[PDB]
Assembly symmetry: D2
Homo-oligomer: 268 residues x 4
């Protein structure tokens, strides 16, 4: 009863109710997991968002660039879950890439300070979280990060794709570390999901050509997906994360599960 | 209650109690699936083997090279599961590669008749089964085949690796077909499992250098696996198959889940 | 002077003057290679085609399914090139997939006899040729086969994609064998080239939907290619084969060079 | 006469005479290319090193983290090569990863400031160089960066592997940009080369376990390589870079050529 029954799971990256992490949290709760959530900057907001989750979850502040947040995370979570209790699950659902770098908008014009911020938050923070959290994880545990397939360049996502390549590589190293703890580390490569940032982009937040490109990306995904892809539905990805959080992929680590409708297996 | 609760699942490829498919079947049953099994040539044997499964399952003959078996499969399974009932799950756990082709034993010396047999049974039969069975599958359904990662050549497995490359490619096409039915098609790439054939090979069935190579392959796997690999335990793979058979990887098709301890993410 | 100056190179697979192998041969000759050609069934035709090459080349019959052709190849080529002379280069530019299997036309409807023929000629023949020819190759030698990227399923090519997956896998094994001889074995993954068969397909030889699909494949290639792709020009692929035949990729084997305009690095 | 005859080629990353870029430069010169070299911090040293090249080459300072260096590069090179002359070739042979991050030495202990420096110099600088230099490149041009295969985690290289994953991803984006100029952008994934830094590491510069690991990596490479790998010889990689710099891989971009002895195609 419950895929995640009895599992304590930290889920980062809720910012709105359309956040992939919101759905992960909701599905994890539906599946019996006890959550601790982390949020970055707008904690009153995140608290209010997360109140809609089917169960209460302690919400902790984690700015993955901080250091002090990271240093105290583990302490703050064992406090939230009770001393002598450890994490079974950690969800990294964190990403960010500044400007220009990202849409439209010339790849070449992103200053390294921005790329570096993006990679910090989007890639390196995966190692950071695993470092902060593996000491309070149980054998049989699972770390899952949110990915998208960056093995081919694409329009618009630019430096964010680079950040995901870095992340996928970080993941395979976290796996090496996580393994000593009996902990899996895996990524879920999602197809495009109409998250608030994503609808803003397709709406022209980042320029016409950025939005046009993402819309094209979305349509081609779905077409390519042998089972289709619904970008308005984060649930198939929430669930895939949960499958990774579960004991049902026990021999899978340093790996990437594609929750993308199979689009990446296809070409056309 | 039960990952696979209420699911009707055909599981091929039980030949002994150390068959990966035996474990898949056992775990599937533990998880509430109702099975139909297929067996190839030694049905009295397979019946006797499968009696040890936690639940009875109708056993059907399927020689995947036959044609008549394939043509009548679907009819025979709807008979076994009851008219108006369809499959939710199909497990292809079938492989075979003759001689020389396979260990030791020169790759170049395998006649095409043997390679072709191997690919028939090991790769093409995946399309065959999906063809025979998709007409009696439910939307939300899942086809899983047993794979090993053939993206790099290795000693000993030779033509069988080629057969797995062909299979992985067949899988991505079955996905296209399966998708029209709302059915996923995926592969599980397992690490080496001490199946009876495999212990025979490491014992020198196919020559000293074949066995030496597989033993080396086994050790390097485990070392590479950030979570280790236990070749004597098919369970982590049974379970991964079940995860694919479940509704917990709903956005994954034409794909390969590596139940290999993460060895393939590693290098060294 | 001449990329391939002083190199003896066997080039298979000329059937017309729009054959990729015709261009390979022409470019190889322009680059100073001395060729031996093999042709399959229509040798008077192939002789007449190959007369247009900038230099004469002995033409040998090689039906890669034969066995006797294979057994006598090596003898027939050392005869053509002079005893005490060996091959430096071997070009496999051979492929074939029967019906239905290939366009339109249901993947599931290709009988294994056809798939097996396709894989024989398209994949296994790569091992066959390397087996026949490595005994008459020089250290520093190079075997190149013609590939297309089958890592993702696509419309229309179906079983031929499977055949290319098998081939890529065969290639990595031939590399292991070739290596003992100081010989590289590599594949060139070409984008779509308007070869006579290919224009026939886009013209509806294999049905409307087959042709529509290939045309779509062609356009998307070119769009995806950061340097574009001209399907009417086999030359960039001829040249890439030559680069592999040369001493300029000396540390590359079991590998695939994508002469595809970079389309495969792109997504969209 | 000369693979690179008449080509103007910028080659970065000479620091010693065992630098991969030194060999690239030497082979490029042997092949008729006219070089402009860039060097980072020790220009008197680099000048003295580069005096041993078979031909004189203007040496320009390029600290790829600078910005002003980048902004003025293009101007400084057109000055070195003569107004109305453009680059045909650009070689990025630049990498760096600080401490701990790199050997031994816990992956988790590298502060982001160090990782970010590493990625700046090792990955982002590839975009930087392409940005600075594409405006002074000729159609038919070629940008080549030095890579190693980071698709699997490995001991010791840690954050540097991540940096290479980022680089490979950067490369596929530079390809998109380079393409508008008729310029290819590709990476060469080299096996391990006993460069001065590398011998220092295997000598214990970074700790015993770092050196042990690299030595193991080196041996396994060579064993895996169907044509062997000689880590003391950068020439097969110099040459592969040259092949990319040449017109002989005209349809290859956003891509990675493995000059690794085929080790990456192998497993074991
Ligand atoms: N379409 C998508 O929404 C998408 C999302 N993801 C991943 O899902 C994860 C969650 O993203 P989301 O839910 O879409 O976006 P979101 O904006 O809801 O969440 C991102 C989260 O990151 C958090 N964050 C930002 N900075 C920090 C910081 N310093 N410290 C802590 N937290 C911080 C932020 O608070 C927010 O909660 C990210 O890793 C995504 O990159 C992965 C892939 C896709 C997808 O982008 C895609 C893209 C291109 N091709 C195919 C598929
Ligand atoms: N070590 C392993 O045992 C191994 C097994 N698998 C897959 O698991 C599946 C089951 O294999 P197993 O359980 O090991 O072996 P098994 O001998 O128990 O089962 C193979 C089954 O195929 C059946 N079969 C043979 N011919 C026919 C036919 N004409 N019609 C119907 N059925 C037929 C046969 O009856 C038997 O039940 C096969 O696809 C394997 O290739 C996949 C990978 C690995 C693994 O090999 C590996 C290999 C190399 N590197 C890494 C990992
Ligand atoms: N578009 C293309 O033309 C294409 C061609 N190639 C490869 O290039 C090689 C040459 O093909 P081609 O020049 O297009 O076609 P072709 O018809 O000119 O040559 C095929 C050759 O195979 C020969 N052959 C057939 N049967 C036998 C036999 N029993 N023994 C000996 N020879 C035999 C036949 O005589 C002919 O000379 C084949 O391996 C192709 O698959 C590889 C890829 C592509 C490309 O197909 C593509 C496809 C899908 N996505 C992307 C790119
Ligand atoms: N073994 C190797 O030496 C190796 C080298 N490469 C690449 O070859 C390229 C050259 O490296 P190398 O010749 O070995 O080392 P090197 O120390 O000779 O050259 C690195 C160059 O980078 C330069 N550099 C550093 N910082 C800056 C800066 N701010 N601005 C401008 N230049 C700067 C530095 O001056 C030096 O000339 C780098 O991209 C390497 O990463 C790629 C792969 C391998 C290989 O590492 C390997 C590794 C793991 N698995 C398999 C193979």
């Amino acid at each position: 009863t419950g895929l995640l029954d009895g599992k304590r799971i930290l889920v980062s990256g809720i910012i709105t109710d359309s956040s992939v992490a919101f759905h992960i949290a909701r599905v994890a709760q539906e599946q019996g997991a006890q959550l601790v959530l982390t949020g970055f900057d707008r904690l009153r907001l995140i608290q209010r968002i997360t109140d809609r989750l089917p169960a209460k979850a302690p919400l902790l502040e984690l700015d993955v660039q901080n250091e002090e947040h990271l240093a105290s995370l583990a302490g703050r979570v064992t406090e939230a879950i009770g001393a002598g209790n450890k994490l079974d699950g950690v969800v990294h659902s964190i990403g960010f890439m500044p400007q220009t770098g990202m849409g439209i908008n010339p790849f070449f014009d992103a200053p390294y300070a921005d790329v570096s911020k993006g990679i910090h938050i989007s890639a390196y923070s995966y190692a950071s979280m695993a470092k902060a959290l593996l000491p309070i994880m149980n054998p049989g545990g699972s770390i899952v990060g949110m990915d998208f397939d960056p093995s081919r360049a694409m329009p618009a996502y630019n430096w964010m794709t680079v950040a995901k390549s870095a992340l996928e590589s970080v993941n395979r190293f976290v796996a090496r570390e996580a393994g000593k703890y009996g902990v899996r580390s895996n990524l879920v490569a999602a197809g495009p999901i109409r998250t608030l940032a994503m609808s803003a982009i397709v709406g022209g937040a980042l320029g016409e050509e950025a939005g046009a490109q993402i819309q094209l990306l979305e349509e081609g995904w779905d077409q390519r997906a042998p089972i289709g892809w619904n970008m308005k539905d984060a649930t198939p990805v929430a669930k895939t994360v949960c499958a990774l959080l579960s004991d049902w992929l026990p021999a899978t680590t340093g790996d990437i599960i594609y929750a993308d409708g199979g689009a990446h297996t296809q070409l056309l």
